[PDB]
């Protein structure tokens, strides 16, 4: 005699699992195969509208790429998705393509997927408002180009920082041609960007938060030219401006908020 929990009817297991909160649920899926399948059950995730790594206790643990894919594939109604820092795969990114109505997407620090998967995902999120696709170390120009080529027009806040050598003026050009509604644009650490690209920002008639921190080849003095953006309100330009000139720049554009 040992209590025969390994024989508890699936029905009951679900009932039990329905009492657990999302993060807890992920743990139990590693208990055994019967539980692993049931924890991925449709009835438990089907309705979620927001899934954010942040809120999943996944700090001191590594989610099996496999299982992350099996749970997300059960969601089509997400409006807020953040998988920041997590290591993905193509199957998983292609699957995210279900949630057509994504509003906010955070994949910064993510990696393990293609320029193609990236395309199929952004292409499907045609009502996307804000995207944080920064520091996906894993990728090349193919991706970056895909990024600026397929983010929906609906975009108002975008964050493409961390691509030192894979992002160029042309890419900003493309981005700008296609996304007229941008309000927040972060291109920090875009070391291929020089002041010649500044003209491109003048076509974003609603851009009020631009950030160009650590774009090491921007001749500090040339920044003045950016206060010429009619709607610009704040300018993050860290680590490339020496105090001397930084105080001058501030005095030239007193209406700007520069850090």
């Amino acid at each position: 005699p040992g209590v025969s929990w390994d024989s508890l009817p699936d029905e009951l297991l679900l009932g039990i699992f329905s009492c657990l909160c999302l993060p807890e649920l992920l743990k139990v899926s590693g208990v055994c195969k019967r539980w692993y399948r049931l924890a991925s059950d449709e009835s438990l995730w089907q309705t979620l509208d927001e899934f954010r790594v942040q809120h999943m206790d996944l700090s001191n643990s590594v989610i099996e790429v496999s299982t992350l894919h099996g749970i997300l594939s059960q969601c089509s109604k997400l409006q807020n998705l953040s998988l920041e820092g997590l290591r993905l795969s193509d199957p998983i990114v292609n699957t995210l393509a279900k949630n057509s109505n994504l509003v906010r997407l955070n994949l910064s620090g993510c990696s393990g997927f293609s320029e193609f998967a990236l395309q199929t995902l952004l292409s499907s999120c045609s009502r996307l408002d804000e995207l944080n696709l920064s520091w996906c170390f894993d990728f090349t120009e193919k991706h970056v180009q895909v990024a600026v080529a397929h983010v929906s027009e609906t975009i108002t806040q975008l964050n493409l920082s961390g691509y030192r050598k894979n992002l160029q003026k042309s890419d900003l050009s493309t981005l700008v041609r296609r996304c007229p509604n941008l309000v927040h644009l972060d291109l920090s650490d875009s070391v291929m960007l020089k002041n010649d690209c500044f003209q491109e920002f003048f076509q974003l008639n609603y851009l009020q938060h631009l950030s160009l921190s650590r774009c090491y080849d921007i001749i500090p003095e040339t920044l003045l030219e950016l206060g010429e953006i009619p709607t610009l309100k704040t300018l993050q330009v860290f680590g490339i401006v020496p105090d001397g000139t930084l105080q001058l720049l501030k005095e030239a554009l007193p209406h700007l908020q520069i850090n």
Binding site: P1, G2, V3, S4, W5, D6, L8, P9, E11, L12, G15, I16, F17, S18, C19, L20, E24, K27, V28, G30, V31, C32, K33, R34, W35, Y36
Partner: protein
């Protein structure tokens, strides 16, 4: 106002028809099949007693975070018995009871690791 229930082991109990009817199952055997002795093929006599008192105590009416103190002490039993109550609640379809017993197992899971879990519930590690 009094119906007769019979356990798998043969014992018969007389419970009030209203208390007895908190078990959808029992209810439906009473109403669409005029069964007076109502045999419960799965529930034995030891378990029926608990079931009956539980229903009796609730004739008149997540988290684990909302388990009534009474229901908590009621479930203060060993795994074996706990296991049998969840099963009994499912066969009889007594929602409330099924409800509280499930949250009670839930709480035993919360906080533990898969390993801890395998140990307290004697679950075999499928992946080994």
């Amino acid at each position: 106002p009094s119906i007769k229930l019979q356990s798998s082991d043969g014992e018969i109990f007389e419970v009030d028809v209203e208390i007895a009817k908190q078990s959808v199952t029992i209810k439906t055997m009473l109403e669409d099949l005029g069964m007076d002795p109502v045999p419960l093929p799965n529930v034995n006599a030891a378990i029926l007693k608990k079931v009956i008192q539980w229903c009796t105590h609730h004739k008149d009416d997540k988290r684990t975070d909302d388990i009534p103190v009474w229901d908590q002490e009621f479930l203060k039993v060993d795994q074996g018995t706990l296991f049998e109550l969840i099963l009994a609640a499912n066969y009889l379809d007594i929602k409330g009871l099924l409800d509280v017993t499930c949250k009670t197992v839930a709480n035993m899971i919360k906080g533990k690791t898969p390993e801890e879990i395998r140990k307290t519930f004697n679950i075999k590690n499928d992946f080994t």
